Amino acid sequence: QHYTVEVGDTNFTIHSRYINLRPIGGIVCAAYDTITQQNVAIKKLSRPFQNVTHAKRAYREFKLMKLVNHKNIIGLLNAFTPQRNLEEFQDVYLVMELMDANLCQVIQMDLDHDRMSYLLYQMLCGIKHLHSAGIIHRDLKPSNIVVKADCTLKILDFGLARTAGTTFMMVVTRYYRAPEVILGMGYTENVDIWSVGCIMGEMIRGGVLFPGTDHIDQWNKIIEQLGTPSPSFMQRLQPTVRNYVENRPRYTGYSFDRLFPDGLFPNDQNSRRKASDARNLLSKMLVIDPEQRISVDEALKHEYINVWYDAEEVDAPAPEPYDHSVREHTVEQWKELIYEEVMDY
Ligand SMILES: Nc1ncnc2c1ncn2[C@@H]1O[C@H](COP(=O)(O)OP(=O)(O)NP(=O)(O)O)[C@@H](O)[C@H]1O
Ligand SMILES: [Mg+2]
Ligand SMILES: [Mg+2]
């Protein structure tokens, strides 16, 4: 059986097993599962078959959640639809273990070095595992990462489809996206290292590094802090964006000592060395030209991170690679695939 309750602006129809629904993060609520006796998170996906773009995103994220297996990526406990057949099928519900906070809420707590380094180590182990499956994320952000009260971190999502294109000139948080993504260049796996450096820098300051109303505002924030990039970089750009990037003000960049001064880190010797190690890592991750930015593996071996290094976490490959396979189908056909996939669960 199932029943219906309203949580804020949204209605949830779920299985009777799930009780005490309350709002969190709204299409996600917290609940108690009576059968397994644990707190859970329930996310409602309203008509995921509604168009080719929503349908492709829902179906891919459903496949990836079951393909991947790592302690730093959220796992599915259950998935169901309370509708009784295909004709009536409308909504899918995903059920997850309930973590204690999102990474925004954790950053707002003003983290020390032990916690910042451990959370970064786990984010990089997660990314490494995703890359081992052929998934390059491109859209990592703190609101889509959650943390347990013991500091275990889990990435909630899988990012942009390989086809998904981005353009400089044309509702979503974009502040953690790499230069190559926002300028519409090609990308490699280290696109995700830029995002991790943006989060690391925000863990230290508490505020967004490169905020901005649009890609143009965000590019200006990037060059004001880090400096104007090289002519070789600019020459890879498409003509419209190239002309814009070439005719901006010429900035030198601030030294990382000025971008992340000692006075914005946790304390004030032991403190000063930990800040110095963090700056060195930022100087390698927040690098505009991806040809000179470090890799995931080099970041995991870095002095700021490697205090947690454990070969069994780090060398933990995906059981299979994802075949970016997810297909031109009608609305009606997308409905059937998603429905049978949910049933199969
Ligand atoms: N498993 C979970 N444990 C604890 N909190 C969670 C969990 N899943 C989601 N949340 C919380 O709910 C918020 C919204 O979740 P999320 O899956 O990001 O939905 P969304 O932002 O509505 N859709 P998307 O565009 O897919 O990110 C998160 O930022 C968390 O605060
Ligand atoms: Mg979200
Ligand atoms: Mg999502």
Rounded to the nearest angstrom, the distance between the alpha carbon of 157 and the centre of ligand 1 is 9
| Cβ–Cβ < 8 Å for 184, 166 | yes
Same domain, 179 and 216: yes
Dihedral Cα 136, 140, 146, 147, nearest 10 deg: 90
CA distance 83 to 34: 21
Residue 135 resides in a domain? yes
Same domain for 191 and 283? Answer: yes
CA 26, CA 92: separation in Å to the nearest integer? 15
Answer whether residue 59 is part of any domain.
Answer: yes
Q: 151 is written with which tokens?
A: 């500091």
Question: Which CATH number does the domain housing residue 217 bear?
Answer: 1.10.510.10
In ligand 1, which atom is closest to the CA atom of 28?
A: 12
The answer to whether residues 175 and 83 belong to one domain is no
Same domain, 85 and 134: no
- Indicate whether 16 belongs to any domain: yes
207 domain residue, yes or no? yes
91 and 105 in a single domain? The answer is no
User: CA dist 218 to 118, 144, 163, 215, 331, Å?
Assistant: 28, 20, 23, 5, 36
The number of folded domains in the chain is 2
- Asked if residue 221 and residue 245 are part of one domain, the reply reads yes
Q: Is 143 in the pocket of ligand 1 (CB under 6 A)?
A: yes
CB 137 within 8 A of CB 68: no
Tell me, yes or no, whether 329 lies in a domain.
Answer: no
**Contact predicate 119/107, CB 8 Å:** no
Mark whether 278 and 158 lie in a shared domain: yes
Both 277 and 131 in a single domain? yes
Active site residue 139: yes
How far is Cα 321 from Cα 319, in angstroms, rounded to an integer? 7
CATH code, domain carrying 44 = 3.30.200.20
The contacts of residue 80 (CB under 8 Å, 6+ apart) are 14, 15, 92, 93, 95, 342, 345
CA-CA-CA-CA dihedral for 74, 206, 29, 37, to nearest 10: 60
Q: Are residue 156 and residue 291 in the same domain, yes or no?
A: yes
Strand order in the sheet with 145-147: 101-102, 145-147, 153-155
Q: Is 41 in the pocket of ligand 1 (CB under 6 A)?
A: yes
Decide whether any atom of ligand 1 lies within 6 Å of the 156 Cβ: yes
Experimental technique: X-ray
CA dihedral sign, ordered 39, 85, 342, 25 = negative
184 a known binding residue?
A: no
Active-site residue, selected from the candidate residues 9, 112, 114, 139: 139
**Structural domain range at position 271:** 101-316
HEC readout, 16-50: CCEEEEEECCCCEEEEEECCCCEEEEEEEEECCCC
Are both 201 and 259 inside the same structural domain? Answer: yes
Identity at 60, one-letter amino acid code: R
150 and 23 within one domain? no
In a domain, 324, yes or no: no
Last residue of a domain, one of 100, 128, 145: 100
User: How far apart (Å, rounded) are the C-alpha atoms in residues 46 and 338?
Assistant: 12
Domain limit, last residue, from 100, 116, 133: 100
Identify which of 290, 292, 294 has the alpha carbon closest to the alpha carbon of residue 302: 294
Angstrom CA distances, 114 to 118, 142, 266, 307, stand at 6, 18, 11, 9
